[PDB]
Structure 1
Amino acid sequence: AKSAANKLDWAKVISSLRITGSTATQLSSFKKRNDEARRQLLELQSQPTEVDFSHY
């Protein structure tokens, strides 16, 4: 699932907690989470390509 990717991500953010000199690796990961969450809402926002021509 998407949850596998995200679980490994947030676990790794908290692993990245346990390592220093990697203070912006997690910020890149956060961005990856953001856009991942963006594409699902992009997809949910969708207007189906076809025009309505049955009713409309």
Structure 2
Amino acid sequence: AKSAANKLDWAKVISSLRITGSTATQLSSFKKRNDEARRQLLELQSQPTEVDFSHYR
């Protein structure tokens, strides 16, 4: 689902003809970008909630 959203967002960014002179939509763009970066960081750095007592205890 994120792939199509990124595709359309980037296509809109690169196809701006009468969509220039903006101040806050780019801010929301970086907000979404850093939100996705935090998503990826959380998935790659998922610590183990339960204690791994099978091998650690």
Q: TM-score, normalised by structure 2?
A: 0.69
CA gap 1:31/1:16 in 2 versus in 1, 3 angstroms? farther
Partner Cα separation in structure 2 for residue 17 and residue 34 of structure 1: 26
Q: Could you tell me the percent identity over the aligned residues?
A: 100
Instruction: Answer 1 or 2: which has greater helix percent.
Output: 1
Q: Which has the higher contact order (CA 8 A, sep 6+)?
A: 1
CA gap 1:37/1:17 in 2 versus in 1, 3 angstroms? farther
Q: Which moved more, 1:42-51 or 1:21-30?
A: 21-30
Partner Cα separation in structure 1 for residue 18 and residue 44 of structure 2: 36
Partner Cα separation in structure 1 for residue 54 and residue 30 of structure 2: 44
Partner Cα separation in structure 1 for residue 31 and residue 24 of structure 2: 11
User: Gaps (5+ residues) in structure 1?
Assistant: none
